[model samples]
Target: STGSATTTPIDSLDDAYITPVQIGTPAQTLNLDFDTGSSDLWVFSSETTASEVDGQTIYTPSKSTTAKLLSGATWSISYGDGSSSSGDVYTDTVSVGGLTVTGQAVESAKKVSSSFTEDSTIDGLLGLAFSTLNTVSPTQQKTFFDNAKASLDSPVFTADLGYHAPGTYNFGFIDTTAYTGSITYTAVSTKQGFWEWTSTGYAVGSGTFKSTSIDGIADTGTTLLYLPATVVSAYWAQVSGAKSSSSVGGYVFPCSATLPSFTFGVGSARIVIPGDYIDFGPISTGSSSCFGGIQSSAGIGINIFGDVALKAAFVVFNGATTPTLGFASK
Candidate 1:
C-alpha cells in the first residue's frame, strides 16, 4: 500500500510544518509536527493535567473503543530545544495520511513543559526517525512509520517542506514530480538513530568551497540550522554587525544587514540556503537586532540541518536499503 499527505506551515510561525494524524478507533484527528529528530508519538490527552494543558487540544482515550492502557508503561522525551513531555502509554489505531497501524503505542502526555503548553496548535509530535530511538519504558515502541513500513510498496518517505507555504510528505513512494532536476543521493549512518550524513564541505557566500567534512542530521523538527562553532563564526563574520551574544545564546545581527547565503555539499552537489532565510526575524518587536537562523552546534554534539536548511531543498528519507538521503532543488 502507498499513501501521501501534504503539510502546511503555521501561518504565524514558519518554524515548523504540521500534518494531520488520526488516533484511536473513531479517529481523533490532531495536527502534529512530523519530526525526524525523535521517535515517539506523544500527544496531549486526558491523562494530562488540565491546568498544565492550557489552550492545547487533548486526545481523549476513553472516548475511543480501541484504546487500551499498557499498565505501568510510561514515556518521557525531551527535544533539542529543551521542550519535554512525559506520560502513560496506550495502544490504539494510529493512522497517518492513508497508512494505518493497528495497536500502535500512543504516549498520552501527563506533563508538558511551557514550550509545548504555549504552542497550542501543535497537538503532539509524529516521529519519523528510526524506531530504535523510541522512548517508551520497559520496552520501546515502534513509530507509526516503522510499524506501517512493512506493508508499504517501498520503505521510504519524502519531505518537501516549503518556506511560508504548503508542502507534501509522501509515504512508501517517491513522487518525482515533487522535485526538480536529478536527485543527489548520499549514504546515511543510522547508528545514532538519526538520518546522519556527512557533507563533503561548505562555504559562506561566494567564497571558495572548503573541503572540510561536516557530519550532521536532517531534522525537520528543529527550527534553525546548527553547525560547528567555527563554521558559524565564519558566516557571522561576513555580517557587519553580527556578534555572538551570550544574551541571546546565538549570533545576532542588525535586521538591515545584508546576510550572505550558505552552501553545504553532499558528494559533488551543493544545497544553497538563501540569504533571506537566515533572518530569523527581529530579536523582539520593533528591535533592530535579529537572531541568526544558522547558529553554533557547540554543545549539541552533531550538527543539525534543521527547517531553515531543509526547507531549501526536497529531501528524501529512504528507509528501503541502507537509508540513503536524496536531495533535489525545490
Candidate 2:
C-alpha cells in the first residue's frame, strides 16, 4: 500500500506510510508504496503544498545530496476511480527497515492528486509489483531489485508484512532469515505480468462458494478484494439478514451475526478469508446497526486481490532473478 489513500494507518498518533529505497542512500525517514500492481519507487518533494495534506510525511530532496533529477522525464499515473498524480523522474538512495539500498532510482512527484493527494494522505507510491509495468524502458530501466540483487547474499528477498490491521504496520525483512521455513511457492503464468491462477472457487459459511473467475492480480496497492458481480451477489446471499445502502455502495448485514468463513483457491492452495474481514468494519445502516463486508462493484471489470489475499500466504516477487513470481514462506 502506498502512503496515500489505499493505506493502513499504524496508530491514532502515527500516520500511514511504507518505506522506499533511494538512488544512493535513503533518508532516515521516507514513505513509499508497497504497490503490487506496478514496479517503481516514487516520493513527494517539498514542492508539495503542506496545506493540501493533513496526516502524512513529505520528502525534501534538498536534504539528500545524492538525489538526482531526470533530464526532463515527467510522469503521471491514474486509477480506475478517477485518481491521478504527476511528478518528475529522479535518483537517490532508498532505505527500508535496516537494509540500506544505494543509488536507487525513483520518481520524485512534484505534484500529486487523486487518491494519493486527496485521500491517501501521503506523498507517493513505491511500486513493488513487477518489471512488466515499470517506467524504466528495457534498454534503460533499472529497479531497486536490479541494483540490490548483486548485493544480497541470496538472489531473492522477501517482504513479511505484519500488523497492518488496527495496529502498527511492521515490515520485516527477509535477509538471511528462515527463507523457506513455512512458505509455499506457486508458478506464475508467463503470458503476461498478471498472476493468473485457476481459483478453486469461493466458500462461505463452510458451504460451497462458486469461484469469481478473474484475471487476478496479487496487488498490495488496494485494500479490499474486488470480485465479479456474480461472485459478489453469491457472497452476500450467504450473509444472514443482508441489506444494501447507497452510502458505501455495498451490502449491509447484521453486525451481531457471525459472518461465514470464505475461501479462495490458488492451484490447489486454498486460502481462507477470516470472518471478521467479511463483517468489514461495521457501517451504520438505520438506527446504528453496522454493515458487513462484500461490497457491490457497479461494473468495474478489474477484480483486485489486495493484501487480504497476500496476508494469508507468503509472497515473493522475484524480479531480481527473472520475469517471474513465487509464493512461499520462511
Each prediction's Cα lDDT score?
0.90, 0.55
Q: Candidate 2 at 4: error in angstroms?
A: 22
Candidate 1: pairs in clash:
none
Top candidate (lDDT): 1
Model 1, runs deviating above 4 Å: 11-13
lDDT of 2 by residue, 279-330 (tens): 4544542444455545544566556666555554456555444444445432
User: What is the C-alpha lDDT profile of model 1 across 1-330, one tens digit per residue?
Assistant: 777778888654477888988998799998899999999999999989787787777799999999999888999998888889999999999888898889999999999999888887899999988989999999899988888889998998889898878888888898888878888999999999999999888899999999988999999999899999999999999999899999888899999988999999988999999898888888888999998999999989889999989998999899976789998987
Candidate 1 structure, TM-score to reference: 0.97
